[PDB]
Protein: Major capsid protein
Organism: Human herpesvirus 8
Amino acid sequence: VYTNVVEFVKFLETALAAACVNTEFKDLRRMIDGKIQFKISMPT
Amino acid sequence: EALLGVYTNVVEFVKFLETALAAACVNTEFKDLRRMIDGKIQFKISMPT
């Protein structure tokens, strides 16, 4: 009997992950929203 | 829901004296400049033949 096994992949061991900050969040089904409030001051 | 951060710009000031523009100028601190009316510089040019 001759079988194949497909090559498995990891997300964090690909060079795609320079474009993402990666924080594992344990219970995301308990979240409604999230927000980031920027406050840009401006010189004149 | 959640706050994930408060991210704020910081204005780093740029002094005129530490620009490289100021090599094109001569900078003197002058205390009372409202008192002055007029400045004046005199040149004397001799021309030999």
